[PDB]
Design a protein around this ligand. Structure first.
Ligand code: MN
Ligand code: MN
Ligand code: MN
Ligand code: MN
Ligand code: MN
Ligand code: MN
Lengths: 308, 308, 308
């Protein structure tokens, strides 16, 4: 019933910078003002203040493992608190590595939740199969149960508890996956929808199946982790890893409009909005408004109209 | 069998200006020259000359109610004359408020026609539920029978006669509807196809249903009122109310190509082309050529080729 | 199992110039370097050196009939040699008129191959029904059996042997067909998929049918002749005959990804990349990378990932 924006302007997740300005842009985009305008109430948790672990030594390859392990541990702590009160937790953040704290904290109250991860990537690189070391590409690794133990524990993420099985997570939009990640998902029979399947089935049937897969038997809580680079660059240019032939505005919306319809949206995740990475101030607006549009959608803003 | 372009460079419908240049752009785009090249004959009625009602006092909120009531009254007068002769009336115009005279005049000869209103809006705001007062958003209100009487009669539109029921009109492309308009359409069980339904069913099935709904029982005449902002801004940027995630070139065409196939196209409506509103001369070309493409399409120009 | 790039920087096919730089751009785009990175081996045949027939007198209308007849005769000669060794022949070339030597040479080793011609055109103009005389629009004419004899034999193409029936070729993407070409395809009951059919069925079903049509009975070798202007100009602007409302990146790929899946790709054809025709160096990159993406795709580069 209630909503709670938890700013998470973290950044250490990846090399490029400018992702901590995300909650700023979105909020500056009047996000909370339009969201209240829905048949929901909104409590802004305000942005979190992350402590930066000194002499953060790159564990093996993994850059900033402590700082990141920590800033995340803090989010889960906070995400678990608001969820514990029965509120949908929208997390305005920086890089997807902050999905570690989001989900975990969410998973702590509802161990049986499921994940509809929308992104053009899998972010399932273990600190081993990972080329270079930017955690914004390892989330699913720290969370998947079937993966724990298959890589060296990282300094600062021990607090985590693999909380979801491969039968609880579904991917949508994939188009730029690595050899390792591909292996891992294939090896674990994870249900996904690469842009190939979409092009084939049409976003319409993608949801019917994503839903008949995750909510077929039981009807548990849903954790939507929306990565902005999931929608074609023509719509979300202000990101770090833009990939053409992606999801469109109308698709990103059919996805959110459908998640609303279920009535199970428990925890959202709007990540990767990088204002700084806009070739023109316009690109940052196109990204910020369709990031917001998406949010509002998850809360009822249908495209056919909404009367009180 | 014959066609008749009726320029309608009216404008008072909305605030922004530059819509009276539409028939000029379109015609300047060699519209009539390519249209003749079809298996049809074309008679250009030339642009209408609209009298501007002096001291046009904003009735309640409704801006320029007289001037607009009048310019429209004139169109119907003219649209009824050419229709009365058995000719398909293409109306190159300014704002959609000129759809009042178009349909009315059309409806006068064929009371049983039906409407396939393609636009990203509903234009069903009554002079009451309407925020601000630009008639380019009230057409469907002056025409729907079920609505007459539910708002103060406006100075200059009395001549109108609500000529169509909610079972005679279908919407295609909707994406930016108001609370009032949404209420009204929902309250009147009007058949519509928001971008949601499209994304789901795919433009292909949208037509089969729009057709099985309007022409299921009888096979009456069709009045296509094509609003240019119905196609994504990426295609029709030169408009006043651009809304992302709209109909694409290929969709606007499948729509027209299908209407041709029925063989019932009686009266067309190409509205909202605003040359002035192009950030670059290019945007006005992209709008003018795909506005034309659309027209030609309504007349047989299939995408698989056309041999004499 | 093995692949062999055969540069074919020919050009005389059409008026505009800059198509011989295609193999240069593509290769310069690291085409062969990424292609080897597949589960395939690659042998670059290097670019061909075409002799230019002196005093090439425009036979009737057909411009440069000798030069073109010859440069093509050479390709078939070469395409037949590598195919004769059991290698998939990718032909980096200029204008589609070089598809004459490609297919012919291919057809010589496998007379029973079939053609999936992806383009926005039919290239089936006979030296008679053809307006102006640029052979880049007559290929299918020199190859179709049902057409041989219906036009004056051309100086330099006699070596050709119509090698495919209208039941062996399928079209995908059509949107700008002439009166003659339309006639000819209609008159010969050729299976095609104009952008209309795509918009209706969705690229997904287009392949199931293109496949159930050509590979229904027997499962013969496939000859994909990919014309770059088959994908909307927004993706392949660097061509000579750009036509809006075309195939998109995701569609061009679903097409290639599917052809890979069959396992019958015998001979490819990447034509019409014109570096010179890019309004901005960017347009030439957008064209060269999605031309390459396409190639890679035909060889296994799925969008869900590829692990060794
Ligand atoms: Mn991500
Ligand atoms: Mn991503
Ligand atoms: Mn309108
Ligand atoms: Mn509109
Ligand atoms: Mn071609
Ligand atoms: Mn072509």
């Amino acid at each position: 019933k209630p909503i709670e924006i938890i700013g998470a302007p973290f950044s250490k997740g990846q090399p490029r910078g400018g992702v901590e300005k995300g909650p700023a842009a979105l909020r500056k985009a009047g996000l909370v003002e339009k969201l209240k305008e829905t048949e929901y109430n909104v409590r802004d948790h305000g942005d979190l203040a992350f402590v930066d672990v000194p002499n953060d030594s790159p564990f093996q390859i993994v850059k900033n493992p402590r700082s990141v392990g920590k800033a995340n541990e803090q989010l889960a702590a906070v995400v678990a608190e608001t969820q514990k009160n029965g509120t949908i937790s929208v997390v305005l953040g920086g890089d997807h590595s902050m999905a570690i704290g989001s989900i975990s904290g969410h998973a702590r109250v509802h161990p049986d939740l499921c994940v509809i991860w929308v992104d053009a990537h899998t972010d399932i690189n273990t600190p081993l199969t990972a080329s270079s070391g930017n955690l914004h590409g390892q989330p699913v690794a720290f969370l998947l149960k079937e993966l724990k133990g298959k890589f060296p524990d990282v300094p600062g993420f021990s607090w985590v508890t693999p909380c979801i099985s491969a039968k609880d997570i579904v991917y949508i939009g994939l188009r730029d996956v690595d050899p390792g990640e591909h292996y891992i998902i294939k090896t674990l029979g994870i249900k996904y929808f690469s842009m190939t399947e979409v092009d084939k089935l049409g976003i319409g049937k993608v949801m019917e199946e994503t839903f008949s897969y995750l909510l077929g038997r039981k009807k548990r809580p849903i954790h939507l982790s929306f990565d902005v680079d999931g929608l074609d660059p023509v719509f979300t240019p202000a990101t770090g890893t833009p990939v053409v032939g992606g999801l469109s505005y109308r698709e990103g919306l059919y996805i959110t409009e459908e998640i609303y319809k279920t009535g199970l949206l428990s925890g959202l995740d709007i990540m990767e909005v990088n204002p700084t990475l806009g070739k023109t101030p316009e690109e940052v607006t196109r990204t910020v408004n369709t990031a917001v549009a998406l949010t509002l959608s998850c809360f009822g803003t249908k495209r056919e109209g909404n009367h009180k």
